Design a protein around this nucleic acid. Sequence first.
RNA 1: GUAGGGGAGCGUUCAGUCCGCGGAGAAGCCAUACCGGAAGGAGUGGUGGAGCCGACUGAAGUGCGGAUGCCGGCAUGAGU
RNA 2: AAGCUACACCUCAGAAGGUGAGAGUCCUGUAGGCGAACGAGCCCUGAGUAGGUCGUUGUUCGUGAAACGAUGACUGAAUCCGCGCGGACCACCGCGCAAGGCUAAAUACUCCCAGUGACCGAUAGCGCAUAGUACCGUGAGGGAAAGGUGAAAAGAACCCCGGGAGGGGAGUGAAAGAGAACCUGAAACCGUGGACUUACAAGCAGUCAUGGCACCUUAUGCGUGUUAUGGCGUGCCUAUUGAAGCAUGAGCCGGCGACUUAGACCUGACGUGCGAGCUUAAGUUGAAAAACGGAGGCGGAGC
RNA 3: UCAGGGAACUGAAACAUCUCAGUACCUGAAGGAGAAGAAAGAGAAUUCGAUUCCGUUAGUAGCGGCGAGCGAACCCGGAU
Lengths: 110, 196, 63, 137, 117
Amino acid sequence: PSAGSHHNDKLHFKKGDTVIVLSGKHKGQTGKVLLALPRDQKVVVEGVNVITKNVKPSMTNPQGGQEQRELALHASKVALVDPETGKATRVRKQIVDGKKVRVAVASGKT
Amino acid sequence: MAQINVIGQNGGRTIELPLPEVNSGVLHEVVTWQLASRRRGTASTRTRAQVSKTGRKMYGQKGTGNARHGDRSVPTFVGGGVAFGPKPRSYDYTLPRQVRQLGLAMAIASRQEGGKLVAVDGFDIADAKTKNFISWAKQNGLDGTEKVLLVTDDENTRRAARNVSWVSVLPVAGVNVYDILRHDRLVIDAAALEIV
Amino acid sequence: PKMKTHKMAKRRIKITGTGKVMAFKSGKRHQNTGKSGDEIRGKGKGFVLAKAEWARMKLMLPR
Amino acid sequence: MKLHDLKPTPGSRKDRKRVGRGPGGTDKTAGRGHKGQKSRSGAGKGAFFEGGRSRLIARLPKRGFNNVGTTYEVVKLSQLQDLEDTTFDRDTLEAYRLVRRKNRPVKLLASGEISRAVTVHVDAASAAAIKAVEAAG
Amino acid sequence: PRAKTGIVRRRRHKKVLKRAKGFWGSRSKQYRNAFQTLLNAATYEYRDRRNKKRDFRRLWIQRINAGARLHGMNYSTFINGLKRANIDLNRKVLADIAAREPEAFKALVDASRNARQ
RNA sequence: GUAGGGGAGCGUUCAGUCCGCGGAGAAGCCAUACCGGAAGGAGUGGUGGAGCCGACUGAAGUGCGGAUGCCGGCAUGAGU
RNA sequence: AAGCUACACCUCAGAAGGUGAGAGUCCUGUAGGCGAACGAGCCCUGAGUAGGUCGUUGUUCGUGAAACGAUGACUGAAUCCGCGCGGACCACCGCGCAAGGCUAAAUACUCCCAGUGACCGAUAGCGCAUAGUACCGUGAGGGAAAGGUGAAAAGAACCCCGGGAGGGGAGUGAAAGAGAACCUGAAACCGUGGACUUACAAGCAGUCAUGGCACCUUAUGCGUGUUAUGGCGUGCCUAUUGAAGCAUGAGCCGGCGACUUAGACCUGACGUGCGAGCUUAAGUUGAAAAACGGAGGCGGAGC
RNA sequence: UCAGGGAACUGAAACAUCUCAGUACCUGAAGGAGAAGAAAGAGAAUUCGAUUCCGUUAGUAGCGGCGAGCGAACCCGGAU
Ligand SMILES: [Ca+2]
Ligand SMILES: [Ca+2]
Ligand SMILES: [Mg+2]
Ligand SMILES: [Mg+2]
Ligand SMILES: [Mg+2]
Ligand SMILES: [Mg+2]
Ligand SMILES: [Mg+2]
Ligand SMILES: [Mg+2]
Ligand SMILES: [Mg+2]
Ligand SMILES: [Mg+2]
Ligand SMILES: [Mg+2]
Ligand SMILES: [Mg+2]
Ligand SMILES: [Mg+2]
Ligand SMILES: [Mg+2]
Ligand SMILES: [Mg+2]
Ligand SMILES: [Mg+2]
Ligand SMILES: [Mg+2]
Ligand SMILES: [Mg+2]
Ligand SMILES: [Mg+2]
Ligand SMILES: [Mg+2]
Ligand SMILES: [Mg+2]
Ligand SMILES: [Mg+2]
Ligand SMILES: [Mg+2]
Ligand SMILES: [Mg+2]
Ligand SMILES: [Mg+2]
Ligand SMILES: [Mg+2]
Ligand SMILES: [Mg+2]
Ligand SMILES: [Mg+2]
Ligand SMILES: [Mg+2]
Ligand SMILES: [Mg+2]
Ligand SMILES: [Mg+2]
Ligand SMILES: [Mg+2]
Ligand SMILES: [Mg+2]
Ligand SMILES: [Mg+2]
Ligand SMILES: [Mg+2]
Ligand SMILES: [Mg+2]
Ligand SMILES: [Mg+2]
Ligand SMILES: [Mg+2]
Ligand SMILES: [Mg+2]
Ligand SMILES: [Mg+2]
Ligand SMILES: [Mg+2]
Ligand SMILES: [Mg+2]
Ligand SMILES: [Mg+2]
Ligand SMILES: [Mg+2]
Ligand SMILES: [Mg+2]
Ligand SMILES: [Mg+2]
Ligand SMILES: [Mg+2]
Ligand SMILES: [Mg+2]
Ligand SMILES: [Mg+2]
Ligand SMILES: [Mg+2]
Ligand SMILES: [Mg+2]
Ligand SMILES: [Mg+2]
Ligand SMILES: [Mg+2]
Ligand SMILES: [Mg+2]
Ligand SMILES: [Mg+2]
Ligand SMILES: [Mg+2]
Ligand SMILES: [Mg+2]
Ligand SMILES: [Mg+2]
Ligand SMILES: [Mg+2]
Ligand SMILES: [Mg+2]
Ligand SMILES: [Mg+2]
Ligand SMILES: [Mg+2]
Ligand SMILES: [Mg+2]
Ligand SMILES: [Mg+2]
Ligand SMILES: [Mg+2]
Ligand SMILES: [Mg+2]
Ligand SMILES: [Mg+2]
């Protein structure tokens, strides 16, 4: 099945952005972007994570071991914010030097 | 009869409509003709034989003890070859001219029970923006509890609302015994085609 | 399409009239003839009867 | 009008014969009879002994005139009609042929029609009523 | 448009199969013997209904002369003598009168015999 | 009442329009003693887990018990 | 949550796809706008000939009264008061200049790409949800079946019986009534349990009648299941004068499987439009739609 | 697409002419197309005006064991 790139293989955000989730259990919760894989539309943000029962043996250890770990989301979270939640986003209109197409919403830069 | 117009004039006008209580008979046959004429003929299926992709002669006409059979490409086989399948074809046919002109006249006529708004110009839309077309229509009882068909002449004026879920545009000419009959009302506008 | 069977045309079977199928009268062609003088004459123009439907579609366009 | 409530004229569409498809009618053998040369088909209008072969009297050509019987011609009210006005006013469809008139009940008033040729007895009843007829000189 | 057989054929077959209750063997489980058994069963249902009319006829009669002869006359010289007693005409299932009230069937015996004298 | 002609219809897919229904659960499947003159159609329950019924019109790859029919699965012979 | 609801908003943009279930206003997009260095793209005028005889042949041309073009064999002209044709042939009257060459466009097709569909949706659709593979053949050549965890791998740490395989718990998850022999899961077929039954019985396997024993969710009845016993009772189809036939076919169940399509074609029934008149074809222009187009076709005169 | 070769089942209710059909097949040459093309023409109006394609003429004129069956062109309307 071809996947992820119905969104023209583009991300609506960057590797280090602060972002908020709207979706399911994690709606309204916030975190820094950590992994952004664009062609599978995956995103990892701090505090979304869960208990991966881990390799029963011999990952240099005899016994296995549960441990909490990051669990990525489809770009079902909603992206950059500044006016303090939600936020659509439009502006790509030249910072200083006039070259970088910075971001904005109904307000200022991101 | 002769319903009131809007901005340009406000005259009466009703043409001698074909109104014997406009039978569903002629109207139905025109609609069927149109839905038939527009149909594409794109339904290929593989012929019993050679269009299907298989072989030869299979084995023993007599004496194997298995049933008779000849090749792997026949409808009795679960292999290939539809016997009497669709093949591409056309359904369009010249319906007689008198009946389609009678049809659209009857269609316009069917809306003189309760329907058919102004044929005249009535365009106070700010060049071309939908919210202002919605206001124009909203002053005419076109609040959109009823789907409505618009016909006119100015790309600037139909462009106002190609979007709205109730209305759909068509230019002058290109009217449809089906379209005006399938929307719940007709904004006839364009007074030129309306009067002769 | 649809041919006429040209075996119908200059052969007997005129199509003509109120839709009925005339044909000729046959025996003593130009095969030999002593025989009667009132039969050698009575071989002009007949007209068949319960076969016409077959004859017509031989030649429904009246060639 | 309601497309739900459109209805074709009763009796203007009848259903196809579905041959096969039950012992509720047209069982087993289809419309067909049982054995015999009735099966995957061929052979036409031919009896396969001797097909009533009658003899052939023959002459190849023909060419026939276009007709204008003058019974419509008298109620016409418009008179003195040259016939190239007539093909381009009504009647006389044929462009490839030549025109002729003929006697049909009466003639009555005067007229003057320029047809390609006509029956001699039209001149017996067109000349009476003070009318000319032009054979095309 | 293709229009495969799906859902139609199973529904038909299941209705036939469900007509088969305690049918023996593959009469209850294979469609083809279930349906075929039902053809012959049609034959039997109709014929039998008509016949059941005539069968209770027979049971009727066979009780009535047993009681009659208990009183010393046969069926023949009894249903005669009620009809010859004319207005006596009760006819339908005299069986039950003979089978439950004998005080009554004795009186009907006396009536028939009086009519034949 | 056989071939055969005639009449009125039931069900399947697709299309147009309507009326709507669906995670408080759809189609499909499963049971059933209700209904219609038949093809059939509903009620309720169990299963399922994402689509779908009813009405009117239109178009058909539209209705299987057979064809030593096809594909597939599974039996009998036999614990031989 | 995208559904319900309540209040808003854009619309030259309500085409579409994704997103934990159905989103105009969340994402990709859409209408519209812009858009690069190199990038692709409209006195003469034809001789081994013309013409002829023999064999043949092409167009409607089957040796027919058979012209004309065409060469295989043998022959073989004339110049502008001249040369070829006009269906044996002749005269007249007409049409045209052979034996030198080139020539775009309207036409065809579909390996390849895009869009669309009263096209399929896993026995369908291409043979292939990919494979000319596996497999068969010395070869030429023939030739399969093909699918689905969950929204997300969070893909089951740890414990228990077992060499394992397999399972039972604990966890995760809405669901493990999804666990990787992973959507639904019919039927034939195999079993385990229960009710009612069956070890002197003769049986197309039912049907109708009545007693017995269970049961009570369209359901305490004219019930439902199952029994005992009586009466009656020769599978189905085909093919046939005549089939239970010791005549054909068939192990069973599932799915595939047979009166169609085409054409300005004929001939009827029914229905609609216009009616002494009715109608277009190819095409042109417009297409979220259809108008135009009389060439031509059918009536109207028959023998 | 053009060319050099060129079948037979079949239909004719048998089969020789005939049909199937210059179809299948083989071979040669070429391209995005190709062929054809600029009148010793069509044809009967002293009309026309290179070629190709479509409609119609018309299943008409004709061909034919005058059997089965095969089947033009001109005029006219279009694409160019
Ligand atoms: Ca043993
Ligand atoms: Ca044994
Ligand atoms: Mg065998
Ligand atoms: Mg196939
Ligand atoms: Mg049809
Ligand atoms: Mg005649
Ligand atoms: Mg039909
Ligand atoms: Mg019938
Ligand atoms: Mg038979
Ligand atoms: Mg056959
Ligand atoms: Mg024939
Ligand atoms: Mg004979
Ligand atoms: Mg005419
Ligand atoms: Mg019986
Ligand atoms: Mg009695
Ligand atoms: Mg539910
Ligand atoms: Mg049901
Ligand atoms: Mg779901
Ligand atoms: Mg079929
Ligand atoms: Mg049968
Ligand atoms: Mg079978
Ligand atoms: Mg098998
Ligand atoms: Mg959506
Ligand atoms: Mg909302
Ligand atoms: Mg020269
Ligand atoms: Mg020569
Ligand atoms: Mg010669
Ligand atoms: Mg000959
Ligand atoms: Mg000559
Ligand atoms: Mg020559
Ligand atoms: Mg001549
Ligand atoms: Mg489908
Ligand atoms: Mg397949
Ligand atoms: Mg399969
Ligand atoms: Mg293959
Ligand atoms: Mg090998
Ligand atoms: Mg090999
Ligand atoms: Mg999945
Ligand atoms: Mg295991
Ligand atoms: Mg284990
Ligand atoms: Mg839990
Ligand atoms: Mg389980
Ligand atoms: Mg499951
Ligand atoms: Mg396992
Ligand atoms: Mg699912
Ligand atoms: Mg499963
Ligand atoms: Mg057990
Ligand atoms: Mg048991
Ligand atoms: Mg014993
Ligand atoms: Mg016993
Ligand atoms: Mg025994
Ligand atoms: Mg019994
Ligand atoms: Mg016999
Ligand atoms: Mg018998
Ligand atoms: Mg036997
Ligand atoms: Mg047998
Ligand atoms: Mg036999
Ligand atoms: Mg056998
Ligand atoms: Mg026609
Ligand atoms: Mg044609
Ligand atoms: Mg032969
Ligand atoms: Mg033959
Ligand atoms: Mg031959
Ligand atoms: Mg070919
Ligand atoms: Mg080649
Ligand atoms: Mg080459
Ligand atoms: Mg032309």
